Amino acid sequence: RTWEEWDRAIAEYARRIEELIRAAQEQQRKNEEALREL
Amino acid sequence: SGIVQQQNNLLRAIEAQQHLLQLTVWGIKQLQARILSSGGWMEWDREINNYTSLIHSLIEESQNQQEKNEQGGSGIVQQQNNLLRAIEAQQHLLQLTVWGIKQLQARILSGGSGGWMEWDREINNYTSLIHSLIEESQNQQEKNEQELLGGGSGIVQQQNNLLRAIEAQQHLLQLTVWGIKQLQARIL
């Protein structure tokens, strides 16, 4: 690869992780709540 | 199921972090071919390979288990073990890239100025934090493996632990990226 491509792949993966983490955070809350109700 | 779905979210975070980590290994390798000709770099390479193959094996196994689990709850405790091992392995691999960035940085830049003292502080802070989170997850994991056989209270807790470890790992990955970028702009 080139360094321009690398820069793009970096940013894309970073954006994907930030999204996954936001989704995991939301699911954690939904699970902890459902667990509190039970 | 929210629990199974959370396992999937974590596995996929690890997976994507693994590609980010491999990208940093490559950027280091480019920098190292431009700056050096081994002085510990032979060993470093062998270590990079070893951890990389182990992470792949743990990721693949976790992929296996994610399939079974999708539909008592032991397959999710077992998967959690593999996710934790993947995170530990990734942490080792990230430490290797930290060693690599420092070696190269010392050849071409003084450690003062340019955000490097801060970079060093922040690396030490999140290294300590992720080691504590890993320790807490190992305690929780051993407890979960005991409470089975024989519910899903420590399962949800462990999801929380693993998530926090992932998040700290992401901070460390952002730091290594910044370090590599500084070196690239400097001599490439």
Side-chain angles (χ1 to χ4, degrees), chain B residues 20-33:
Chain B
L20 194 54
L21 208 32
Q22 285 307 329
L23 266 42
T24 70
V25 170
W26 175 92
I28 290 156
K29 266 142 166 212
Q30 296 307 106
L31 284 171
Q32 187 258 290

PDB file of all heavy atoms in Angstrom, chain B residues 20-33:
ATOM      1  N   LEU B  20      -6.578  -2.356  12.666  1.00  0.00           N
ATOM      2  CA  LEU B  20      -5.896  -1.125  13.021  1.00  0.00           C
ATOM      3  C   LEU B  20      -4.480  -1.446  13.564  1.00  0.00           C
ATOM      4  O   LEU B  20      -3.517  -0.901  13.088  1.00  0.00           O
ATOM      5  CB  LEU B  20      -6.758  -0.293  13.963  1.00  0.00           C
ATOM      6  CG  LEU B  20      -6.422   1.181  14.223  1.00  0.00           C
ATOM      7  CD1 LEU B  20      -6.315   1.990  12.952  1.00  0.00           C
ATOM      8  CD2 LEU B  20      -7.422   1.839  15.155  1.00  0.00           C
ATOM      9  N   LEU B  21      -4.354  -2.393  14.490  1.00  0.00           N
ATOM     10  CA  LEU B  21      -3.043  -2.790  15.009  1.00  0.00           C
ATOM     11  C   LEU B  21      -2.089  -3.237  13.878  1.00  0.00           C
ATOM     12  O   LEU B  21      -0.927  -2.795  13.843  1.00  0.00           O
ATOM     13  CB  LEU B  21      -3.199  -3.879  16.057  1.00  0.00           C
ATOM     14  CG  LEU B  21      -2.205  -4.093  17.194  1.00  0.00           C
ATOM     15  CD1 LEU B  21      -1.503  -2.839  17.714  1.00  0.00           C
ATOM     16  CD2 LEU B  21      -2.995  -4.736  18.329  1.00  0.00           C
ATOM     17  N   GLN B  22      -2.589  -4.058  12.939  1.00  0.00           N
ATOM     18  CA  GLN B  22      -1.756  -4.533  11.825  1.00  0.00           C
ATOM     19  C   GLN B  22      -1.303  -3.380  10.931  1.00  0.00           C
ATOM     20  O   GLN B  22      -0.172  -3.345  10.504  1.00  0.00           O
ATOM     21  CB  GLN B  22      -2.433  -5.657  11.039  1.00  0.00           C
ATOM     22  CG  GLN B  22      -2.408  -6.972  11.796  1.00  0.00           C
ATOM     23  CD  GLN B  22      -1.014  -7.336  12.245  1.00  0.00           C
ATOM     24  OE1 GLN B  22      -0.035  -6.984  11.579  1.00  0.00           O
ATOM     25  NE2 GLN B  22      -0.902  -8.043  13.380  1.00  0.00           N
ATOM     26  N   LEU B  23      -2.179  -2.420  10.696  1.00  0.00           N
ATOM     27  CA  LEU B  23      -1.796  -1.196  10.019  1.00  0.00           C
ATOM     28  C   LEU B  23      -0.611  -0.440  10.671  1.00  0.00           C
ATOM     29  O   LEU B  23       0.288   0.068   9.967  1.00  0.00           O
ATOM     30  CB  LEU B  23      -3.000  -0.272   9.906  1.00  0.00           C
ATOM     31  CG  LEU B  23      -3.856  -0.317   8.619  1.00  0.00           C
ATOM     32  CD1 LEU B  23      -4.097  -1.729   8.129  1.00  0.00           C
ATOM     33  CD2 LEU B  23      -5.187   0.412   8.798  1.00  0.00           C
ATOM     34  N   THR B  24      -0.621  -0.361  12.000  1.00  0.00           N
ATOM     35  CA  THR B  24       0.460   0.291  12.752  1.00  0.00           C
ATOM     36  C   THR B  24       1.747  -0.534  12.644  1.00  0.00           C
ATOM     37  O   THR B  24       2.839   0.016  12.515  1.00  0.00           O
ATOM     38  CB  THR B  24       0.063   0.632  14.227  1.00  0.00           C
ATOM     39  OG1 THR B  24      -0.059  -0.555  15.012  1.00  0.00           O
ATOM     40  CG2 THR B  24      -1.256   1.399  14.322  1.00  0.00           C
ATOM     41  N   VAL B  25       1.631  -1.855  12.650  1.00  0.00           N
ATOM     42  CA  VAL B  25       2.808  -2.704  12.471  1.00  0.00           C
ATOM     43  C   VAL B  25       3.482  -2.428  11.108  1.00  0.00           C
ATOM     44  O   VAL B  25       4.712  -2.376  11.012  1.00  0.00           O
ATOM     45  CB  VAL B  25       2.451  -4.189  12.609  1.00  0.00           C
ATOM     46  CG1 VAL B  25       3.625  -5.080  12.192  1.00  0.00           C
ATOM     47  CG2 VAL B  25       2.003  -4.471  14.041  1.00  0.00           C
ATOM     48  N   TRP B  26       2.662  -2.178  10.089  1.00  0.00           N
ATOM     49  CA  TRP B  26       3.143  -1.941   8.753  1.00  0.00           C
ATOM     50  C   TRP B  26       3.826  -0.595   8.679  1.00  0.00           C
ATOM     51  O   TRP B  26       4.893  -0.473   8.061  1.00  0.00           O
ATOM     52  CB  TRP B  26       1.979  -2.020   7.752  1.00  0.00           C
ATOM     53  CG  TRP B  26       2.363  -1.667   6.331  1.00  0.00           C
ATOM     54  CD1 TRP B  26       2.789  -2.540   5.320  1.00  0.00           C
ATOM     55  CD2 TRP B  26       2.396  -0.321   5.706  1.00  0.00           C
ATOM     56  NE1 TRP B  26       3.064  -1.849   4.165  1.00  0.00           N
ATOM     57  CE2 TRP B  26       2.845  -0.522   4.321  1.00  0.00           C
ATOM     58  CE3 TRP B  26       2.104   0.969   6.139  1.00  0.00           C
ATOM     59  CZ2 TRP B  26       2.984   0.540   3.430  1.00  0.00           C
ATOM     60  CZ3 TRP B  26       2.265   2.038   5.240  1.00  0.00           C
ATOM     61  CH2 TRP B  26       2.700   1.828   3.918  1.00  0.00           C
ATOM     62  N   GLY B  27       3.188   0.422   9.263  1.00  0.00           N
ATOM     63  CA  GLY B  27       3.715   1.789   9.274  1.00  0.00           C
ATOM     64  C   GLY B  27       5.049   1.796  10.008  1.00  0.00           C
ATOM     65  O   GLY B  27       5.992   2.446   9.577  1.00  0.00           O
ATOM     66  N   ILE B  28       5.135   1.053  11.106  1.00  0.00           N
ATOM     67  CA  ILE B  28       6.413   0.901  11.786  1.00  0.00           C
ATOM     68  C   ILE B  28       7.469   0.257  10.873  1.00  0.00           C
ATOM     69  O   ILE B  28       8.594   0.784  10.745  1.00  0.00           O
ATOM     70  CB  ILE B  28       6.279   0.191  13.133  1.00  0.00           C
ATOM     71  CG1 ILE B  28       5.560   1.125  14.128  1.00  0.00           C
ATOM     72  CG2 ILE B  28       7.632  -0.245  13.670  1.00  0.00           C
ATOM     73  CD1 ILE B  28       4.864   0.407  15.269  1.00  0.00           C
ATOM     74  N   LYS B  29       7.112  -0.872  10.248  1.00  0.00           N
ATOM     75  CA  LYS B  29       7.995  -1.532   9.282  1.00  0.00           C
ATOM     76  C   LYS B  29       8.495  -0.625   8.139  1.00  0.00           C
ATOM     77  O   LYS B  29       9.656  -0.644   7.806  1.00  0.00           O
ATOM     78  CB  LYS B  29       7.382  -2.833   8.785  1.00  0.00           C
ATOM     79  CG  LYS B  29       7.856  -4.024   9.600  1.00  0.00           C
ATOM     80  CD  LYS B  29       6.702  -4.995   9.789  1.00  0.00           C
ATOM     81  CE  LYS B  29       7.167  -6.346  10.285  1.00  0.00           C
ATOM     82  NZ  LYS B  29       6.263  -7.403   9.747  1.00  0.00           N
ATOM     83  N   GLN B  30       7.634   0.206   7.576  1.00  0.00           N
ATOM     84  CA  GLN B  30       8.090   1.181   6.611  1.00  0.00           C
ATOM     85  C   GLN B  30       9.141   2.128   7.201  1.00  0.00           C
ATOM     86  O   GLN B  30      10.186   2.350   6.603  1.00  0.00           O
ATOM     87  CB  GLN B  30       6.912   1.989   6.084  1.00  0.00           C
ATOM     88  CG  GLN B  30       5.906   1.156   5.309  1.00  0.00           C
ATOM     89  CD  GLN B  30       6.541   0.346   4.182  1.00  0.00           C
ATOM     90  OE1 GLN B  30       6.698  -0.875   4.289  1.00  0.00           O
ATOM     91  NE2 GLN B  30       6.908   1.025   3.099  1.00  0.00           N
ATOM     92  N   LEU B  31       8.832   2.696   8.363  1.00  0.00           N
ATOM     93  CA  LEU B  31       9.697   3.636   9.047  1.00  0.00           C
ATOM     94  C   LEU B  31      11.027   2.986   9.392  1.00  0.00           C
ATOM     95  O   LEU B  31      12.084   3.579   9.224  1.00  0.00           O
ATOM     96  CB  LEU B  31       9.023   4.139  10.314  1.00  0.00           C
ATOM     97  CG  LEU B  31       7.934   5.177  10.045  1.00  0.00           C
ATOM     98  CD1 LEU B  31       7.162   5.461  11.328  1.00  0.00           C
ATOM     99  CD2 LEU B  31       8.506   6.446   9.415  1.00  0.00           C
ATOM    100  N   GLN B  32      10.966   1.742   9.828  1.00  0.00           N
ATOM    101  CA  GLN B  32      12.144   1.009  10.210  1.00  0.00           C
ATOM    102  C   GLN B  32      13.082   0.694   9.017  1.00  0.00           C
ATOM    103  O   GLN B  32      14.331   0.641   9.186  1.00  0.00           O
ATOM    104  CB  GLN B  32      11.692  -0.227  10.941  1.00  0.00           C
ATOM    105  CG  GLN B  32      12.790  -1.043  11.565  1.00  0.00           C
ATOM    106  CD  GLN B  32      13.081  -2.228  10.704  1.00  0.00           C
ATOM    107  OE1 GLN B  32      12.262  -3.155  10.607  1.00  0.00           O
ATOM    108  NE2 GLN B  32      14.214  -2.186  10.019  1.00  0.00           N
ATOM    109  N   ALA B  33      12.501   0.510   7.825  1.00  0.00           N
ATOM    110  CA  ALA B  33      13.316   0.257   6.627  1.00  0.00           C
ATOM    111  C   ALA B  33      13.951   1.575   6.180  1.00  0.00           C
ATOM    112  O   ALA B  33      15.048   1.576   5.663  1.00  0.00           O
ATOM    113  CB  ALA B  33      12.493  -0.382   5.498  1.00  0.00           C
TER     114      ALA B  33
END
